[model samples]
Target: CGRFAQSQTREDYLALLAEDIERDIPYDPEPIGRYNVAPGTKVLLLSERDEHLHLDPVFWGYAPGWWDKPPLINARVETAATSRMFKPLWQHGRAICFADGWFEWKKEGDKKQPFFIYRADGQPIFMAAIGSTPFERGDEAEGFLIVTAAADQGLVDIHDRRPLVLSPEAAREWMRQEISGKEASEIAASGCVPANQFSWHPVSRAVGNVKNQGAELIQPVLEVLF
Candidate 1:
């Protein structure tokens, strides 16, 4: 469910994060305009390094050395804390991915329609995540995965799972390096943004192709859902 998403420039994210957390480093990269951000591509990850907030582009998938299948792009929140594959990450690899919105495909008989989902209030979405990227394990080629929760009733029609999003304050708490696994998981359990805070509309089917990049893909297109 975290396969496709949208992201703004470095400047845009910094300005948004500034309202919630203090950045200790003066590192600001160039603008990255990606309206069609798919897994396997580099997505900005916000985490604490050296006890200071920092943002870095990280590959958006994860598979440990022992894993053989395709890398995972989303981790289920219900079992991550005690999961054999995600236990370590739950403890120390906590991070956040800031996004403008995400895309989900709705099933209609034999065909699937794409919909763009974003905050109803027009605020940025702070996605809860965990990773083993270089920032966490010093591994050169590691990646991260977005944490996902079962969709509430309102969003279940579009997709069964959505990213675990946090508010401005709870997001910073999720990034704290000193919190325990249980504490972090509890924060995730209690702090995720509710389904009612979001809005969705059918969009151009062009989003099905990863090569197509533009704001136009997100433009609402009228389609009968009932």
Candidate 2:
């Protein structure tokens, strides 16, 4: 689903939550800002800790000790609740990823074209996620995966699945630890931001490189002028 993503700055996070960072526990105060965020890199995640909301930088992959494969970046919503690798995460790791947008590749004759997808209304998209609890900033095991669902309403042309995102209210609810895994799944299934609220445009292939960064990377590539 999501391989590359763009992050929101600390200001964006504060504005989204409409609150200030209260605790300095984990000690990484500044949220890393990047236009081209790749797997294994740090991303900002919001979750409840000690009955308060916290925003912190975390690795963007999920692989428990039992998993022999590379860390996973996306978790399918359809089976996350029952999957051996995601069951525990689904139950206790409910969190939200604060992102400006994400990239998806479309297969062409010989090349795969990348497109940037974001909220049509220009609001940040809060992607539903699950991960290991008690996130340790540098702990490789303390990574997270964006939850994804089957694409519909034309976005399927870019990819069969996209991150399951939610509205602000629903996103806050998702981070609650008291809810059961089934309840969380229900929220993800029924509360995703509607497809109509999003739009996509082709972006330069430069985004394919993790070293490349800037606002220019997300600029539209081909525009027809009258």
Candidate 3:
């Protein structure tokens, strides 16, 4: 259920870029208004370079050069440090997945109800993870996966897993390359976006279709029993 379907104009997307950095760099047009971005699609990623966040687009899958299996979309933070699928990136590279909200489906009898989850204050939430590669293919490939942790109480009823979210302060700390693993673990363990800080509500079943886009899909469904 995690997709960023809202479209922002190219100018607005550029405007959101930190102005201190040169603004003339080429970027994929903002995929604003896109609601159900699935795996294998390019999505926005922001990473710190020279102390400034650089906005780039990368696919959301993890596959190493020698891998023969399908790429994974999520990596458990508990084993990320030791998992062959995630360790190298965890030690050397990282990025933030920026978004307005994410989707989750709760099991209710035979129906799986979709829920739109977002910060109650209406701020964008950043899912934190170490990234490998960028948007390249062939000889060099680049993709990423959302780092996940045990579900918090608010989300335990919906799913047993949740993406690791970094607060602005924690983002700053993570951006620093000098932080130790022990310190980083402490930060990551305590860094979940407070469970109660988010609001969730049932949404239209149209969201189940990847083809559905626009704001309507995120609207609270009122006619049907949730």
Candidate 4:
């Protein structure tokens, strides 16, 4: 259900992975750090290529073998280990998505107010994701899904599901294949407790329009002391 997001420069994101980058690949000095990133956009993805971690650009939507049309953007953590569409990726096609924060809408009768949810400590949120095997989309074969689990503690009011955010230690282990895919799904489902380790604030309604982009959209709609 996630359709909007944000991230920092490719260089900054790579730094957070806590690994040496494959120098030959080089980074796109200029990355799309969208404060209002939407689906269908090519995004920054990180994965272990051989033994080194590298930044790879992949489409945000996941195109399953059976789905000929619209791709699924979010994978349900509840069934990640068992669902055919997700298990393959879980088994051997996992990756990390970098985002400083993400946007969600809170219903207020006819008005859908937007809010920005980010780590309370301001560290980059290393989101758990699953990708497609090469050739799945031909030239655009690089595709991924942001895995989500049921919301925790205080976040259900914003949404019922939250991104499968991982600890820095777990994130590295995930890419290194130290953890099994089924275990990844289990952690996603019930292991990452307090799934909501963030703070959110109402943002400008302009975020409703993907076309409307800027730091302004991320600004609080109303001044607050909280």
- Provide the overall lDDT of each model, using Cα atoms, as 2-decimal numbers: 0.81, 0.79, 0.68, 0.71
TM-score per model over all chains: 0.90, 0.89, 0.81, 0.85
In TM-score terms, candidate 4 sits at 0.85
Q: Compare the candidates by lDDT and give the number of the best one.
A: 1
Model 2, 1-226: lDDT tens digits are 4554555456655466535454333443454558888888777778887767776678889877777888888899889999987899999988888788889988876788888999999888889989887765556755899998888897988888889989887887888878888888788877899777889988888888888877787888872220
Residue 134, candidate 1: C-alpha displacement in angstroms: 2.8
Q: Per-residue lDDT of 96-141 in model 4, one digit per residue for the tens? A: 8878777888776776777888788878777888887441333353
Q: Is candidate 2 or candidate 3 better by TM-score?
A: 2
Encode model 3's per-residue lDDT on 1-226: one tens digit a residue: 3444434444443343345454333555555666666667777666665566666668777777788888777878888877776776776667667666788888888878888877788766667767774333411244877788777767777777777877766765664567765666677777768677878777888888887777787788863764
**Model 2: per-residue Cα lDDT at residue 39:** 86
**Which pairs of residues collide in candidate 1?**
none
Q: What are the root-mean-square deviations of the candidates from the true structure over C-alphas?
A: 2.7, 3.1, 3.5, 3.4
Name the top TM-score candidate. Answer: 1
- Candidate 3, run of 10 with poorest lDDT: 133-142
* Residue 62 displacement in candidate 3 (angstroms): 0.6
Q: What C-alpha lDDT, on a 0 to 100 scale, does residue 5 get in candidate 2? A: 57
